[PDB]
Structures are given as C-alpha cells and as structure tokens.
Amino acid sequence: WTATSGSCKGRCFELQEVGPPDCRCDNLCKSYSSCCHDFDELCLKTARGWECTKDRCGEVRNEENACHCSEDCLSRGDCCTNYQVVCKGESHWVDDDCEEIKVPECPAGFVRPPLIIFSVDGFRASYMKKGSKVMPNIEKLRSCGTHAPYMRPVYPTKTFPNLYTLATGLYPESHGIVGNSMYDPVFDASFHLRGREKFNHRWWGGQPLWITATKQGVRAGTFFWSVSIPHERRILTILQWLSLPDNERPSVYAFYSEQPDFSGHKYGPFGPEMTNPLREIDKTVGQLMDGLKQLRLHRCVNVIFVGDHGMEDVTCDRTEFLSNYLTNVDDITLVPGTLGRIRAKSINNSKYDPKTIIAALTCKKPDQHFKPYMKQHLPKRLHYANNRRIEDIHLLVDRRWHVARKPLDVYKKCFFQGDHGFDNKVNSMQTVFVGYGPTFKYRTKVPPFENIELYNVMCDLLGLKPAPNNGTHGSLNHLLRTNTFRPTMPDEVSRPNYPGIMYLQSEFDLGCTCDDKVENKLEELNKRLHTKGSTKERHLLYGRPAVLYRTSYDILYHTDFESGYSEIFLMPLWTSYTISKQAEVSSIPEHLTNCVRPDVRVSPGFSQNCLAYKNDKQMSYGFLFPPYLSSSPEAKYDAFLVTNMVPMYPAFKRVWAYFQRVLVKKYASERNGVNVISGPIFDYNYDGLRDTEDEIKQYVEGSSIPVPTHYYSIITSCLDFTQPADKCDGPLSVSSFILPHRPDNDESCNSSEDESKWVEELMKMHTARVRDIEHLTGLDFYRKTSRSYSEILTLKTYLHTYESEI
Ligand SMILES: *[C@@H]1O[C@H](CO)[C@@H](O[C@@H]2O[C@H](CO)[C@@H](O[C@@H]3O[C@H](CO[C@H]4O[C@H](CO)[C@@H](O)[C@H](O[C@H]5O[C@H](CO)[C@@H](O)[C@H](O)[C@@H]5O[C@H]5O[C@H](CO)[C@@H](O)[C@H](O)[C@@H]5O)[C@@H]4O)[C@@H](O)[C@H](O[C@H]4O[C@H](CO)[C@@H](O)[C@H](O)[C@@H]4O[C@H]4O[C@H](CO)[C@@H](O)[C@H](O)[C@@H]4O)[C@@H]3O)[C@H](O)[C@H]2NC(C)=O)[C@H](O)[C@H]1NC(C)=O
Ligand SMILES: Cn1c(CC(=O)N(Cc2ccccc2)c2ccccc2)n[nH]c1=O
Ligand SMILES: Cn1c(CC(=O)N(Cc2ccccc2)c2ccccc2)n[nH]c1=O
Ligand SMILES: [Ca+2]
Ligand SMILES: [Cl-]
Ligand SMILES: [K+]
Ligand code: NA
Ligand SMILES: [Zn+2]
C-alpha cells in the first residue's frame, strides 16, 4: 500500500527518494506503484512532440508542451534539443568539424567535467562498421574520440550480468547477478526479468558506481529508466538536471536504450528490420549532443557510448533437447537457453547423481551442439564458478544454438531470430566502446579490452576512489589524455634462497634411479657457471616473477632453464625458459626413459620421491622444462632432476607431452623464438585465487606432494617478430593458458584420435590472461622490462581468443 494522493508539482524526476506511503516522483515510482496521481500529467508531457518548428520560435511559454521553443527556455533548461538550430540559425553538432578538446571548456561553477554513460543493449561490435552509413552522430563520436574495435562482455553474455559488471567492475560470480534468471538455494528464491523479486537488495553485491559516487560526495542522476518513458524524455531529463544549480547538479549521468537488443531478438542481428533501430539510436545521440551544445557543454562533458553484449542468429529449429539424452529428464530443473544450468528438481531426493547426468550428456551425438561441465571445470577465463547461485552442472552451448529440457518447453512456455548469452570470446557477442570528451584522447584507436576494466576508468573520470574490483587499475590509462591513477608494482613479500651444492647423493632415499653414471676442466668450469646463473639472461627475460605471499622457496639455475622451487609445495612455482627459432627438438634417449635424479641443492625432506608415484596407481608425473628441448645431451640430465618433476594423470600427460614436444617448437618457429613460463596452479575451492597449503584436497598417495588442479604457461615473444624473443627492443606479444589437470579427456570428444586432432583445440578453449595466472599463483610477472608499467598492465590483461577478424 501507498497513500499515492500528493503532488509532483515542481518535483518531476526528483533526485532523492521520499519513503512511502508519501507519493514519489523519481523514475522508479512506476516500478513500485507509488507515483503521485499527477505524475503522468506533469512529468510525462508529450504535446507538440520533441522538435521545434519555425512557427514555434519565440512562442509564448505554454507549460503543457513536452519541450519549449520560447525565449526563456535556455535559462529554464527545457528547450527542445533542436531549438538553437531551428530558431537561432545554429548547426547540428554532427555537422561541425571536430576539433580536439585539449582542456575542459565548462561553464563557471562546474567543479569537474560531467560523465554521461550512454548504454545500448545488444549493440554488437560490427554494427560500428556495418551500419556506419546510418549512424552519423555515433560515427563522429567514434572517429573523433577514443574507440576500441570491440569490447569483451563478461560471461554469461546476458543483459543484467553485463550492465551490473559495467557498474561495479566485478565478475558476475562476485557481484551476484549470474544470469537473467537465477535461483538462490539459501533464499529458496527465484530472480527473473518479470517480477518483483529482482528489486530486493539482497541479490546485488559489490558497490555500483552511483553508490561509490554518492559516498564520496559526488552526486549521481538515476541510472534506471522506466520502459515506458520515451528516449526523448530521458534525454530531456538529463539536460534539465545539467541546468540545475551547482550544489544540486549531478556529476554522473546514465542513459539506457532497450534497442537494438529488442529488435535483434525478433529479426536477428542483421535483419533488414535492424536499420531503423540503429537510425533511432543515432537520432537520440544527436539530440543529446545538440542539447549539450545548446548548454555550452559539448566540450565539457565526457561521454561514454557502451554496449552490454552483441547478438547472434538463433532460431527454434536449432534447439537441442535434454529429453533426447536423458531418461530421467523430469528429475532435473534446467535454466535453459544460450547456456544451460542443471540442478535437482527436488533436494529431498538422495538418488540424484550429477556424474551420471554429466556422463549421459558427454559426446553422445556426433554433431552435439553443447558440452556439459562441472562448473569448476569451466575455462578459468570465464570466472564462472564461485557463487552458490551457479549450479554445479553447466552446459556451454554452441553459438547459434539453444538448449531446452523437452520439446514442450519450446512450443508451450518460431518467436525469435536472434539471441545472446554464449561464451564471451565469441565474435557475435562482442560489443562497443567509444569515449568522447576532454579527458579521453583525440582520434585514438585502442586495442580491444574487457568491460570489467571500465569501473576503474569511470572512477578516474570523476576523481573517485574505486571500491575493490576485478579491473586492473592502470590497464586502461592509454584511453586517457590525463590520468588520476599512477599504478605501482606490488612489493615482493618473499625473497628467494639461492642454494648451492649441499647434499651428497647417498643422503637421498627417493626410490629414484637414473642411468647417469658416465663421466675435463673445459666443460667443468662451464657447468659450474650454468648452476650460478650465467645463462640466466637468456632464459629469464623479464626478471624473476615476484612472490606476493609469505613462503619458502629457492631459485634454481640450469643451462636450459631457471626455476622458483617451493619447499612448501615440493615443486616449482614457476619454471622459465627460452626456445629460439633455431632450436632443435630431440627425443629422450632409451636409457634415460625412467630417469629421475636427486637435486644436491635441495634436501631430501623438501623433495618429491619416486616411490609415491609407484604406489599411486592413478598418478604419474611429467616435467616442467621438457627434456625434448634440452640444448645438449649433457644438459638433458638437468631436465630429469626431481625438482623439475610435477604430478600428472596419464590422461593429462597426453596433452602436456604434445604441447612440450610439438607446440613449443611451432610457436618458436612462427613467433621467432618464445620465452615460456610454466607451473602448477592449486584452486580447490574454485575462487580464482591461489590456495593456501591447508586448502589442498588431493595428494599423490602416501605423500605430502599436492596435486595441481591446473597447469599454466605464459608464452612471450617480440611484437615485432623480425626481432628474436631474446633480443626485443620494443613491445611484447603474449598468449597464455590454464589447462585443467584432469584424470580423463572426456572434455574432448575426439581424444581417441592423435593429439594433432584435439589438443590444440582444447588449449584454445582454455586461453587465459597473464592476470588470471597472477591471481591463481600469487606471482607477479614482467617485473624487469624496458616497457612502461601501464603498457605491461595492458599486456597482462590481454586475451588471445583464436576467433577470426571481427
Ligand atoms: C574480484 O574482485 C573481488 C572484490 O575485490 C574479489 O572478491 C573479494 O575476495 C575476498 C577474498 O575472497 C573477500 O574477502 C572476504 O570477505 C569477507 C566479508 O565480506 C563481506 O563484506 C564485503 C565488503 O563490504 C562484501 O563485499 C561481501 O559481499 C559478499 O557476500 C554478499 C552476501 O553473502 C554478496 O551479496 C556479495 O556478492 C559478496 O559475495 C561474493 O563474495 C563471497 C566472499 O565474501 C563469496 O563467497 C560469494 O560467493 C560471492 O562471490 C561480504 O558481505 C570476510 O569475512 C573474509 O574474511 C575471512 O577470511 C580471511 C582470510 O584472510 C580471514 O582473515 C578472516 O578471519 C575470515 O575468516 C573467517 O571466515 C571463514 C569463512 O567463513 C572461516 O573459515 C574462518 O573460521 C573465519 O571465521 C574475507 O576477507 C571479499 O569479500 C570479496 N569481495 C567480493 C565483492 O566478492 C575477488 O576475489 C576478485 N576475483 C578474482 C578472480 O580475483
Ligand atoms: C536493486 N539494486 C540494484 C539494481 C537497481 O538499482 N535497479 C533499479 C531499480 C531499483 C528499484 C526498483 C526497480 C529497479 C534495477 C532493479 C531491477 C532490475 C534492473 C535494475 N542495484 N543495487 C540494488 O540494490
Ligand atoms: C536496465 N535498465 C536501465 C539502466 C539501468 O538500470 N542501469 C542500472 C542497472 C543496475 C543493475 C542492473 C541493470 C541496470 C544501468 C544503466 C546504464 C549502465 C549500466 C546500468 N534503464 N532501464 C532499464 O530497463
Ligand atoms: Ca582458491
Ligand atoms: Cl540466464
Ligand atoms: K603411478
Ligand atoms: Na574423450
Ligand atoms: Zn536481449
């Protein structure tokens, strides 16, 4: 109930919310059925339309009109956006040549350039090029301001998860909005687009930009606009707010458009019907910019034009049904669509088995258009696991497809030709970014980046201190003419030990054997120098990674590779090596097949042992620096040290061996040398963060040797490939991956074939940013380069996606 019989007289779109049962006039009142009786009459005028016409010029102010052409309108802040063009002989903003904005050009009393967020739903990246003929205002913004070829949304590439990530800089797993449809088990509540449940604050974690601004004394317009409020009224409300007195005027504003997403669903992304919505959005941009020019704010305001996600061709006849795979299809609940999420229909059943459900969904049809995963097995780059609202079973759906439970749900719940929500690396899901204003650069193209990074930039743009978030502050400094934020390298917490030869062979009882007993002062001073780090300039190209937590570890030097060896985890945290274009692949000599040698630098008690691997019938081992790449027969014995060994499932050894034996050489060959840093990752609670020792759930049997959940590698070369990796004078190029360490290869439906038909495809799926590896290991890479830190941060957030050109 609300006593909704007061007045909006003079309070249309008020900035502070009055609490019911006193009637409201803010743009949420509709949504609460709490507007005053006269809200529509006063606050939603429509008479005479949105544009001034010649005969309206200098009219008598008639307060009934939607907007004004009278003489006093500029001062009242409520002209139609084309007033000065039609009545004062001015030009439209879009017709003016663009001129660099070196400094903010703001009216007196403006303490800072305002920020206007212009967000567009379903605005696919390729609309920028493909609809450019019909979007001249947006095209001016793009080409005169700062723009990226595309911006990467978060997964799932749904509307609420993406708008709320833009507002907070958090992954959906952290902010809580994990889909457009959710069930929380602790709430026993369901969140959907339809309904009032979504209005409860309990769903929305993190700290959104409007709250960050308010707490630090920067005033915000409202971000939400009622569906029925026309775009023209939204623009005019923003322009009015910008005319308010200094102490009342907000500094941050948002506009939101339901287009082109609304039409995209009906007609597909490139439907003939799509041209008009794009014309309409452009016209709205034109109105804002003309309105700004009228108030002399068009060289004062920073404007962000930003989409939440793209749109893909999706039809009913491209639906996979779970009823075609499962016999017990009525015992499950599916969140359906462009992603699947499965849980038990009832938790008062103990005969429900996620493993048999997964088994029944794995590689069952030759052309299967989805793949099941336990959520902790999803590619780490999606950061989609660490929330109770995300079901244990997940289905990644092929682009262009849907998954549904039964056929009845598709004809009793074709409508659509477009949808979105797929893996965020998919081209059709990419969206847009343009920054225009005094704080952004002039006519600048920047590389594609992730939408998680913008919260930090918007905080910079408003002199705010960002709440803790998943952006890497400084990674987008290159978008900005002038920067609030100067990033600094985090301090190393643990410094290394540099052990020398301290143990005799016979002190070890590791159950290891090696055929190494075959014997010169030339090649003896030489091997000493190798163990003291003479070749370290070659294998450690960007300085040793810094360890950012308290621990105990040793640097180990070798001819071919250097490592940071953890005495706590009994294996390296990182192993670093350079393979030049010229370098040769050899095989492991027959006599050295089962060779594992004690490391006389490292005590028996801080070593692994071969016996545990013998007793453990599931678990074998591999090496971080590959024997296959040893520079000499003599150097190869180094690769067999117990300190280079790591636990590996035989199924995973197939993946690993193929990478070390075939792929490193190929990359070296294509990229003109590569530097490789490889190591273990432990993330048993799937939160994307390095596990402490007391979190490890699995050990090689009868030992203290912890089993990694994943193995990473970071592969760096010179961006200018005419220079070799080991002699690069400019920017770097990197690709990385975090491979799940799995006892089977069920993920790859083709794994019975040769490694050359499936392994690379799997690695591509599990591509990662260096930054994801930093979170997962507590290491910090690229500490010693010739490059600026902002550029390095940008490098660390790069993701190699393996998609073709947008
Ligand atoms: C992406 O960026 C984000 C943001 O920076 C990173 O997430 C942070 O990670 C931190 C480490 O995991 C985490 O810090 C913990 O916070 C606990 C208190 O948190 C509350 O307050 C904050 C601040 O206002 C708030 O953000 C939190 O909000 C969460 O919960 C609400 C409601 O439940 C949600 O609405 C909201 O979405 C958010 O949920 C998300 O985070 C939680 C974890 O907090 C997840 O579980 C959810 O699934 C969801 O993802 C909270 O309201 C604090 O109590 C913790 O302290 C414990 O651990 C430390 C270790 O140092 C120890 O010293 C303490 O004593 C304490 O231990 C005690 O509790 C243990 C477990 O209960 C128990 O075993 C012990 O016996 C002790 O009693 C801890 O400091 C921080 O909260 C989040 N922030 C957010 C927003 O998620 C994220 O890591 C980044 N991602 C990547 C990949 O880098
Ligand atoms: C709720 N909420 C939100 C989200 C929000 O503010 N709105 C605006 C809103 C506020 C109140 C009622 C309706 C919409 C919203 C709500 C649902 C769907 C889409 C946006 N963020 N923090 C918080 O706590
Ligand atoms: C969605 N939506 C909005 C826009 C909106 O509410 N938010 C706030 C919001 C908060 C939480 C979820 C979604 C939006 C927004 C606006 C611009 C950029 C980012 C977010 N207006 N009408 C509508 O229907
Ligand atoms: Ca963890
Ligand atoms: Cl969803
Ligand atoms: K074994
Ligand atoms: Na398989
Ligand atoms: Zn949509």
Swiss-Prot record:
Localisation per UniProt entry: Secreted
Listed InterPro entries: Alkaline_phosphatase_core_sf, DNA/RNA_non-sp_Endonuclease_sf, Endo_G_ENPP1-like_dom, ENPP1-3/EXOG-like_nuc-like, His-Me_finger_sf, Phosphodiest/P_Trfase, SMB_chordata, Somatomedin_B-like_dom_sf
Top-level taxon of origin: Eukaryota
Modulation of this protein's activity: Inhibited by vanadate. Inhibited by micromolar levels of bile salts, such as tauroursodeoxycholate. Not inhibited by taurodeoxycholate. Not inhibited by hydroxysterols, such as 7-hydroxycholesterol, testosterone, dexamethasone and prednisolone. Inhibited by EDTA and EGTA.
GO molecular function, one term: phospholipase D activity
Binding residues annotated for Zn(2+) 2, in chain numbering: D261, H265, H420
Motif Cell attachment site, residue range(s) on this chain: 76-78
Record PTM: N-glycosylation, but not furin-cleavage, plays a critical role on secretion and on lysoPLD activity.
Residues given in the record as Ca(2+) binding sites: D683, N685, D687, L689, D691
Catalysed reactions, semicolon-separated: a 1-O-alkyl-sn-glycero-3-phosphoethanolamine + H2O = a 1-O-alkyl-sn-glycero-3-phosphate + ethanolamine + H(+); a 1-acyl-sn-glycero-3-phosphoethanolamine + H2O = a 1-acyl-sn-glycero-3-phosphate + ethanolamine + H(+); 1-(9Z-octadecenoyl)-sn-glycero-3-phosphoethanolamine + H2O = 1-(9Z-octadecenoyl)-sn-glycero-3-phosphate + ethanolamine + H(+); a 1-O-alkyl-sn-glycero-3-phosphocholine + H2O = a 1-O-alkyl-sn-glycero-3-phosphate + choline + H(+)
Function: Secreted lysophospholipase D that hydrolyzes lysophospholipids to produce the signaling molecule lysophosphatidic acid (LPA) in extracellular fluids. Its major substrate is lysophosphatidylcholine. Can also act on sphingosylphosphorylcholine producing sphingosine-1-phosphate, a modulator of cell motility. Can hydrolyze, in vitro, bis-pNPP, to some extent pNP-TMP, and barely ATP. Involved in several motility-related processes such as angiogenesis and neurite outgrowth. Acts as an angiogenic factor by stimulating migration of smooth muscle cells and microtubule formation.
Protein name: Autotaxin
UniProt source species: Rattus norvegicus
Gene: Enpp2
